[PDB]
Amino acid sequence: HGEKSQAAFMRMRTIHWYDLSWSKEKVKINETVEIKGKFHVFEGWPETVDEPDVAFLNVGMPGPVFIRKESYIGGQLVPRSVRLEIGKTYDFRVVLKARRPGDWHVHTMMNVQGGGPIIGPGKWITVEGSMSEFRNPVTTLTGQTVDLENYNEGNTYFWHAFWFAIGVAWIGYWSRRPIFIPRLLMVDAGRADELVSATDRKVAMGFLAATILIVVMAMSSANSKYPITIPLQAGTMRGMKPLELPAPTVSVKVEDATYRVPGRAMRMKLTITNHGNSPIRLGEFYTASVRFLDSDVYKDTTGYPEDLLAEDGLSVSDNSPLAPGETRTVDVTASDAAWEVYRLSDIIYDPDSRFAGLLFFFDATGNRQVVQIDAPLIPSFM
């Protein structure tokens, strides 16, 4: 819900999310929904964004309407920040547990230490039930099971109320007598030395000694109880395992790319060379969370968000099968209302008019090839 405002070229060339899947579209309270997919770190990472040396796999959502039970990059849990390598493809998996009823737009996002949020596609997930039924149990290494919704809440309230009461008692003790104007007049007109006299000093000594003694006793008691404590666990985690993708058998060279101002379409001319031994066909163009599909070649079945999905938004001038070894140049047009709804047309406002995306090529048997394209995007006005 935080994208459509970021720069179009920055959304195009940071991170490409694909193979996204959602386990469920509608859940009950305490029910789990799992989000899977892959993201590729673009080679032409913008210089204004710091390299993803420190990155965190986050969830885009309006507060804890879900709780993040687990999150994985590769196959290993990532509760801390992680290091990503430019040009690598990683697979991710986020497990969410429903907490608050309603209709929520859930995004998978990557926060980069020096570049800000990179928001992936968002999907509407319905939560039904009552928040009062939500439980977040956890078992500690000390052998006790607690609910994270209310654990330590009573202790926190008690201690804060106790110390607030001590401070209020001090202030009220001094506030029983007249406060401002008579004391000001006494201090000004001659030496005061009358508004602070025993047993006021004795009361202050008692307050100070009691404060120190209570702090020490409370610390000792909180050490006898909970004798086993550990510090906060933090630190960027290295050695994220990237996907070992096979080398693509399709090479694509972008010969100019244009978009009409104003308009809802993007046009580019591609020289596609088919290696390997199977006839390929262009089935998809993904630019920034928007999938332009050639419906005659490929159809989406993973429940991709409709406002981000162009079922027939990809038109190829000659999308006949491309025989192996054969090279041809075609005009590819990606047109959909999403191009203007998600403000991908506002790249005219950007200080770097370059686009990047993913082309998905499909053969007859159905196996697909992913190739990455990037080129300057030239607006056309007449």
Binding site: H1, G2, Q113, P182, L185, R343
Partner: protein, 236 residues
Amino acid sequence: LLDKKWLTFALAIYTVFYLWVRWYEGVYGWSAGLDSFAPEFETYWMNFLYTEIVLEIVTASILWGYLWKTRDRNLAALTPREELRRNFTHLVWLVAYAWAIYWGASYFTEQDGTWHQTIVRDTDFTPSHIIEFYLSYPIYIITGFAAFIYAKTRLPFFAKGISLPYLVLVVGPFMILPNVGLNEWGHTFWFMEELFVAPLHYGFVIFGWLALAVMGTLTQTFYSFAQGGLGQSLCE
């Protein structure tokens, strides 16, 4: 008569209006207020911004102009009892200023932290921002200016000169509003992380310090209270 029930209204108007504002932002925070380019955002928060800015400008102009036009020309022939009554009215103005300062610089500022700490900010005019900078700040600025003008135009102690502590207390917290430019500039450009303790925030802190001039302002009001009707009793 002396202190009258204008203090009750001073507390209640801010309390009720800001409770309604909190209800409004609780209802329209999500669901017309998350997406800054949705049409419903324009009808529920951009319209709110426009209406509140126009109403704040009109109210500030009317209030300040009325206070300045009804200024007491013959301050010399003011009885001590009337001076005491005017001092109490000025204290009511200061109470209203303190209440508005609380609502602006604590409640809506920190609630703002929560907002940003929970969502991806989509614009310089988040539904909540509209509430803090374009309401929790102009309202307290208007109240502070009105209190300063009332002191200058009704209290002989605060007449015949501009009180430095009062001017600081009134203008420093006002400088937080133009400081929003530094907030925006150093959110989009400088600093991309949502950290409340980032240096892009020291402009709010520096001018929040100037509210400490309330100490000199209040000792000045104490002296103004204790001019003719200082007692006796006190120091007797």
